[model samples]
Target: SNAMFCYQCQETVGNKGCTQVGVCGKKPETAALQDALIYVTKGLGQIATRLRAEGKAVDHRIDRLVTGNLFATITNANFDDDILAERVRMTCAAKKELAASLTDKSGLSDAALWEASEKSAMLAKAGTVGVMATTDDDVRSLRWLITFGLKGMAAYAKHADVLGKHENSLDAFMQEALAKTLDDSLSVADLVALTLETGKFGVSAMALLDAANTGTYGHPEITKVNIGVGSNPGILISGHDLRDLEMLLKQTEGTGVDVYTHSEMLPAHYYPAFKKYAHFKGNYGNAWWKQKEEFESFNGPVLLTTNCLVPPKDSYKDRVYTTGIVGFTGCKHIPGEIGEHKDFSAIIAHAKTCPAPTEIESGEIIGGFAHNQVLALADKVIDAVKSGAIKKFVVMAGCDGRAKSRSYYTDFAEGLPKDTVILTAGCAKYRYNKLNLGDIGGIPRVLDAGQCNDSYSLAVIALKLKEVFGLEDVNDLPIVYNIAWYEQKAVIVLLALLSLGVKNIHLGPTLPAFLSPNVAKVLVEQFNIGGITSPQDDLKAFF
Candidate 1:
């Protein structure tokens, strides 16, 4: 137990860390602590749903209250009881305020765990929340994973909505699901239906985010992001917000604090918004899991705006700051309260006191293949294919892993014919995403479609291609499948694609444990679903 064990969220990342231990190597004690915190989060939602039923304006603040709590509970994020308590206190207050505006008393009830006294007892009752509490492990696990994925989608949707990409459908479904978790009458079938609804709503959430991003910052055009090391001491801004990074750069302007991106935050560098920040250097590490070391050398305050936050190692824990939905115990939390501007000044101030990020790797990696940007280069792309210059377009889209086998993605990218292009989305792009894979004519072989939630962009690009080719189906377009999924959001994205009738997807690392054999078979038979094999073999199959 000293080394820790279990394969829950971290399964794809070396199959270590589980429902028992957590992938960031969180202990059973820490897991229980987070569980306690989530219970409070569920309580707040229950309260809010009751108020909403009475026909009140829940508003952005209250919505953020729920979204923020969910974000905290995400794996490797917040684990501090004090921080959780403050968040819970705020949410509870919001719930109370919302409740007062209500006439209907139909409030969200407590998750089953809240009623239990012991950790073992609570874990045993995982399904006690949404309506009917059940003891069926398969059903509960499957549903739990789906809910967690919904949680991920909710976080992204909430962030996007904060930037004015509001999707009312996702917001409504989240409240409904949150309420249903407390209902005792909802059945597994009901939960399954809700699960699909979760994915369906996730489609809307992603679409909203895409609109918010492109509409605000402009479509991501192919650009070379400097992943290289700079001379000045730097502050690393991790997570998904370009606006936050821009603010940090603005504050740090000429202050000698070099700025950088990490993990899901990498795409920010490709946007025009960040182009003027000369002090905004480049990326530092691989993904969230590698931060234990990366943060140490970076030697500056790390600002997180969202999840995938590993509990900071003691070595660098003090240097972490969080804003938006991301929280970690003891780290400085910057409030970006609804309708208020965030001051990243604290992180900038801290950066003034520290050294720059420790240089891990140095080089320029190209990204920015969002739908509009890619479409802009469509002529060159089509000509490359017509001239037999590019034969395949391998869609390496989805979440990345800390697993050893994930190297296959890199190897797979390396082996792709120089003419082949990599269509990437999610942190999964981190695997082969930074490789200097050259180009097919003028187009970089690796085209990042954006965050994991932005997998919808890949789907959009596919559908557009279908239209351009005068084809009836997206599957008929010239694309090969090789997707890596680790979380529920990825699950929703896959289902969203399925709902759209795109087939023959190759999902990998390993299949979900929640999928009963019958269900797995159903997906395989109905969708041509399969797992990844050797990269060489996969490449052959893809071509």
Candidate 2:
């Protein structure tokens, strides 16, 4: 009964509980644990601010430690009490060190924080100090939206750090901003400025992640992945991480267990590095939200490499596997220590006894993973554009949610003329992906650039096109941005696009609850940000 009561993220602290925790694999206690993690995060931010306010430079290690802490607590990454508590202690120690170094302002004492009460009390109280508290429903909602975006940006930075990529400037800004959230004297105007700045750091975080992924896995290339469902028992890999998918493919080679990508992991197929794994098959399932039924029918052991996990039904919980940052108490977990290669042999052995994935839709839906792949066919694309066969490229990337209106994406895709191309990344593609929208000659109507994080790839592709076309500004390019966001990752992606100077971007189904009106207005006036309406109107405008 108590299980349904907890959640802290935008969608699921309580209002959406029935389907939230049960579907996303979280419990009431887990929510409490996450809240506690935020407490430590506030402490870390406080310490980081004290040092900087005193004109002292915070070390890179503490910056990383703080960034890593925020990343671990985002969405479905880490919920373990012990892990979060340890992170808190580490952050507390760092805060102490920072305080000791800053001799000017009086430092916050652990004693004052020692008796910090519940999650809300601590966060709300800390917010009183640094947070620009807003009681206005609309303004508060918008501000919460921006704050969540920072969570996603922090998550990506942490991910890149695992691959030996570090962005100090971004981390510095993040620390300072985290501290700013605690500054009570700050006006709404100042808080709004910080929100947009958070989006700026989000830009750097995405660039870092993009570099880390491409540098390690090589640029993704277009390839026909075998989505063929065979009789042999298979192991389904979900979430992001080409390297992990590649590693499993290597380990499972000749082992008779088939490997399939699910959700965000589907992009793994587009990478040249993953193509070498002959046993690696095509993708299964739609978005992360649909995993309950898909995972159940797959019957094979499913490995979630990252978030966007729907809490599993008991029917399939035992068969689900989590690696890297994803975790559940009873579900089998394959620990991926930082910088160390994970051995999925254990999962492979488990797959031996399981059944092959249940076939959901046999037909393949194409176009995604990276822009390099799309550019390889540049001649065709350029030809299409020149010949008036393809008049526009609409960037329709982000996440999918349970809201029925998301069908608008499918309808919107259907409404687009055959001459139009949809440039997309993320499971959001599922809305219109399976529709089999024909192509402009050889190029598919949908140009998928891979997972949500890979929205950076779309930005990269846009910049390249800018150069190729000799455009004065990227905004002058023919592409229209109509991105859908459901989580923090999408927030980072949106921010990254904004940082790249992409403008007039339309985001929906609803704006995030984290941005204040003033902040949202700045976004609108400065960047022309808006939301979606009728697909018919949207198609006319974008197409």
Which prediction has the highest lDDT against the true structure? Answer: 2
**Cα error, candidate 1, residue 164 (Å):** 3.4
lDDT of 2 by residue, 305-394 (tens): 778676678998888887776776678888773545888888888899987777777767665548667668777777777788888889
lDDT of 1 at 387: 85
What is the per-residue lDDT of model 1 for residues 1-543, given as tens digits with 9 covering 90 to 100? 232222335362333235445556565555554554455556656666665666655676666667767766666566665565566456555566665666764433544114444545544443233212335654555556555766777767766866766655577677667666546577766766676677677778788878887777777777777777887777888877766765677788978788888888888876776787688788888877677787887888888877677777888888888887566667888888342478876777777788656677777888888888878877777778778888878888877766788888889988888878889888888878667788767777888877786788788878877877788878887788888876656776876777778788888877766565655666788789998899999888866
Residue 237's lDDT within candidate 2 is: 89
Clashes of each: 18, 26
TM-scores vs. true structure, each candidate: 0.87, 0.87
Which residue runs does candidate 1 get wrong by more than 4 Å?
A: 1-19, 36-56, 86-133, 181-189, 337-339
The alpha-carbon lDDT assigned to residue 175 of candidate 1 equals 69
The root-mean-square deviation over C-alpha atoms between each candidate and the true structure, in angstroms, is 3.9, 4.0
